[PDB]
Design a protein around this ligand. Structure first.
Ligand SMILES: *[C@@H]1O[C@H](CO)[C@@H](O)[C@H](O)[C@H]1NC(C)=O
Ligand SMILES: *[C@@H]1O[C@H](CO)[C@@H](O)[C@H](O)[C@H]1NC(C)=O
Lengths: 50, 50
């Protein structure tokens, strides 16, 4: 969290079922949009940080 | 946080239609019977006025 790495997403077919596969995953709440709308929604220049 | 708004709707309502149902979302193929998780969430979301 001190030195957070950033990465940019493009030309991506994003399926979030694989995220639902992992039992340890416990945070799916989205500050942006409803998770159901997330599957239907499309974006550009998607930006992720870890 | 007493005020609440419905985050999840199964089917878009009719004109002048009302929904009072409070059931955890069943988007998961497995029934989310009293279980809130991946593709499962009760439709109510707190307004949480600040
Ligand atoms: C589903 O989740 C399990 C549990 O981690 C994982 O091993 C598997 O690769 C995932 N995908 C499929 C297609 O089963
Ligand atoms: C990590 O890799 C496995 C392949 O063994 C695959 O199921 C998926 O990409 C990841 N596993 C998860 C998310 O459970």
């Amino acid at each position: 969290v001190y030195a957070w790495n950033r990465k940019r997403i493009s030309n991506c077919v994003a399926d979030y079922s694989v995220l639902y596969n992992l039992a340890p995953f416990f945070t799916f709440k989205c500050y942006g949009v409803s998770p159901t709308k997330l599957n239907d929604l499309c974006f550009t220049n998607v930006y992720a940080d870890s | 946080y007493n005020y609440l708004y419905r985050l999840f709707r199964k089917s878009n309502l009719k004109p002048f239609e009302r929904d009072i149902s409070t059931e955890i979302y069943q988007a998961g193929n497995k029934p989310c019977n009293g279980v809130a998780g991946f593709n499962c969430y009760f439709p109510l979301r707190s307004y949480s006025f600040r």
